[PDB]
Amino acid sequence: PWKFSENIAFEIALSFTNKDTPDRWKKVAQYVKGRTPEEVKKHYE
Amino acid sequence: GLFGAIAGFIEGGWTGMIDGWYGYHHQNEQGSGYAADQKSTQNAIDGITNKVNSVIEKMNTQFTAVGKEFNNLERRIENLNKKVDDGFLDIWTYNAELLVLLENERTLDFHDSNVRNLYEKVKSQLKNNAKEIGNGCFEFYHKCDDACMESVRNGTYDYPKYSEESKLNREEI
Amino acid sequence: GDTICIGYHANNSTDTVDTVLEKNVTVTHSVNLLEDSHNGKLCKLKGIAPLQLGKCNIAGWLLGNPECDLLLTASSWSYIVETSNSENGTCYPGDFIDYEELREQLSSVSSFEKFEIFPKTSSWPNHETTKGVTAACSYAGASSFYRNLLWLTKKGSSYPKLSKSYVNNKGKEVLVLWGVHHPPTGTDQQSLYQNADAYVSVGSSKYNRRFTPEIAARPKVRDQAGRMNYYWTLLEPGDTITFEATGNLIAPWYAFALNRGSGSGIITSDAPVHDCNTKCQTPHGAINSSLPFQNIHPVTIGECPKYVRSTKLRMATGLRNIPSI
Numbered sequence: 001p002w003k004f005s006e007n008i009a010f011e012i013a014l015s016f017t018n019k020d021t022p023d024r025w026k027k028v029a030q031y032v033k034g035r036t037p038e039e040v041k042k043h044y045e
Numbered sequence: 046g047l048f049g050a051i052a053g054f055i056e057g058g059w060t061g062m063i064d065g066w067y068g069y070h071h072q073n074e075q076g077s078g079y080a081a082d083q084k085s086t087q088n089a090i091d092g093i094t095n096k097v098n099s100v101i102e103k104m105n106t107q108f109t110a111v112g113k114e115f116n117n118l119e120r121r122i123e124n125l126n127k128k129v130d131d132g133f134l135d136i137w138t139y140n141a142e143l144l145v146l147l148e149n150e151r152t153l154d155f156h157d158s159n160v161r162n163l164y165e166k167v168k169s170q171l172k173n174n175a176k177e178i179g180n181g182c183f184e185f186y187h188k189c190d191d192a193c194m195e196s197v198r199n200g201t202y203d204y205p206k207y208s209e210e211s212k213l214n215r216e217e218i
Numbered sequence: 219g220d221t222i223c224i225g226y227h228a229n230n231s232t233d234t235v236d237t238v239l240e241k242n243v244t245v246t247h248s249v250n251l252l253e254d255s256h257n258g259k260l261c262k263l264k265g266i267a268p269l270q271l272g273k274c275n276i277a278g279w280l281l282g283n284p285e286c287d288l289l290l291t292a293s294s295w296s297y298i299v300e301t302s303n304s305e306n307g308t309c310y311p312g313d314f315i316d317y318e319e320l321r322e323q324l325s326s327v328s329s330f331e332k333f334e335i336f337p338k339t340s341s342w343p344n345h346e347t348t349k350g351v352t353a354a355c356s357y358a359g360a361s362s363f364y365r366n367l368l369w370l371t372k373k374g375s376s377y378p379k380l381s382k383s384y385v386n387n388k389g390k391e392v393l394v395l396w397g398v399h400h401p402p403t404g405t406d407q408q409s410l411y412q413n414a415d416a417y418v419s420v421g422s423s424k425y426n427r428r429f430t431p432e433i434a435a436r437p438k439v440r441d442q443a444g445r446m447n448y449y450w451t452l453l454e455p456g457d458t459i460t461f462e463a464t465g466n467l468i469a470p471w472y473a474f475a476l477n478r479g480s481g482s483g484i485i486t487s488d489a490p491v492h493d494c495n496t497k498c499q500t501p502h503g504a505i506n507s508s509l510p511f512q513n514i515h516p517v518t519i520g521e522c523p524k525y526v527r528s529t530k531l532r533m534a535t536g537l538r539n540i541p542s543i
């Protein structure tokens with residue numbers, strides 16, 4: 001399950017993540033509500 | 046501005062906080078930098094996507110709509126047919142355009158409220174301890190480490206602890 | 219002293235929305251709600267190709283105009299396509315009665331099984347089945363006629379009264395087509411049907427009609443002074459349709475047992491057909507989008523974004539943005 005609105009909480013949170021990744025990287029996942037750090041993980045391509 | 050806290054008494058934001066929508070620039074003995082607020086940011090996101098979700102949830106997708114054929118003696122019902130088609134388009138074009146102009150302005154000063162809202166969640170956590178020079182700035186009378194400073198951002202505290210440190214600093218200048 | 223300030227986000231984003239008070243307003247974050255993009259191709263829906271009528275239109279297809287012979291094997295389709303290039307018609311001039319309604323009918327049809335309703339060989343021992351061609355429908359240099367209809371004529375000096383019935387055992391609607399012929403002159407009546415005054419009668423549980431030929435000198439269309447009217451009916455399951463004539467009957471030859479399904483239609487476009495699959499189709503091309511709106515085409519097949527007249531639909535999400543000197 002992936003929705004237009006969830007591809008809304010996602011890309012704003014990928015503006016919060018870096019090209020040399022400055023994080024344990026769930027700094028995207030806490031903003032997704034919903035689907036997991038798991039379900040978030042694969043979804044970056 | 047609406048709530049006054051963007052393009053505001055704070056006339057600019059900070060390029061260098063990449064971590065979220067809102068946060069705190071703090072400076073002290075140790076050193077300076079940005080730390081985002083992951084509370085009011087996750088509040089605003091989940092609220093805003095939910096706004097974006099809601100308009101589209103009020104959109105059933107289009108299902109199959111194809112043109113109709115009429116002969117040369119059916120002109121009137123053909124024009125009737127055109128009229129219904131144009132009419133429904135004019136309305137949906139209106140509703141879509143207008144709504145986006147409307148809700149954008151309501152989104153902009155949604156954020157303007159949320160900066161103002163966090164500013165006073167601090168000022169009300171501060172009281173005696175500091176001064177307001179404006180532009181977001183609360184200058185601490187009493188000394189603060191990072192930890193004490195992570196404590197305003199935490200919201201956790203106790204107020205009198207740094208009180209006596211602060212109070213006699215207010216006088217001689 | 220020690221200073222803690224409070225403040226908000228900023229970015230390099232050049233993205234720009236509109237609001238009611240202010241326009242050109244630059245924000246950290248956007249969405250576009252409007253789709254400008256298609257693949258320029260007519261594609262499948264649900265594994266199934268559209269039916270490309272090519273140079274033929276629906277009448278040409280159903281009557282079996284000799285130019286349409288590529289279509290004869292077509293059975294299933296997801297939706298029907300005509301081009302700016304389809305003239306291929308009723309090749310003998312005349313009226314096709316309730317044409318637009320038949321098209322409207324066809325749009326609820328997913329597939330059919332064509333079948334020979336009155337086989338050419340068996341059906342008409344007392345009439346001529348082989349003389350039924352005309353220069354107005356010409357294939358491969360020669361006079362010819364529709365594939366799905368049979369033009370009956372006198373056998374020798376005799377056109378005896380004919381009566382033919384068909385009972386529908388298909389368990390579905392059967393589309394039966396036929397025609398009535400009006401020659402230019404009594405000589406032509408006599409040369410063709412041998413009987414000076416004549417009738418075609420057609421009836422069913424729905425249908426009751428008696429046609430009498432109208433013999434007139436007419437302006438010439440595709441060289442014919444005569445005219446041919448085409449008719450149709452949907453013969454319900456179990457029903458009988460009975461034809462009787464003393465002449466002038468262009469008899470059914472082939473007919474169609476229909477299968478209904480929703481979410482199809484008939485579109486017009488010059489786009490090429492490809493092996494692509496899509497959830498949404500327009501005459502300009504196919505859309506794959508999660509977007510709520512589209513500026514592409516008003517006409518749609520399948521599940522689509524809504525159409526509007528908008529060039530620009532853009533919605534703010536993040537804060538506005540400072541250039542910071």
Ligand SMILES: *[C@@H]1O[C@H](CO)[C@@H](O[C@@H]2O[C@H](CO)[C@@H](O[C@@H]3O[C@H](CO)[C@@H](O)[C@H](O)[C@@H]3O)[C@H](O)[C@H]2NC(C)=O)[C@H](O)[C@H]1NC(C)=O
Pocket residue numbers: 283284285305306307308309354355356440
């Ligand atoms: C299938 O479709 C095409 C239409 O694209 C038919 O072709 C056209 O047929 C008519 C025959 O009368 C032609 O028009 C004639 O033009 C001549 C002069 O060129 C004129 O003297 C006649 O009065 C008439 O206007 C037309 O030019 C021709 N065009 C093409 C593309 O060849 C064709 O007959 C159709 N076949 C059947 C079986 O319906």
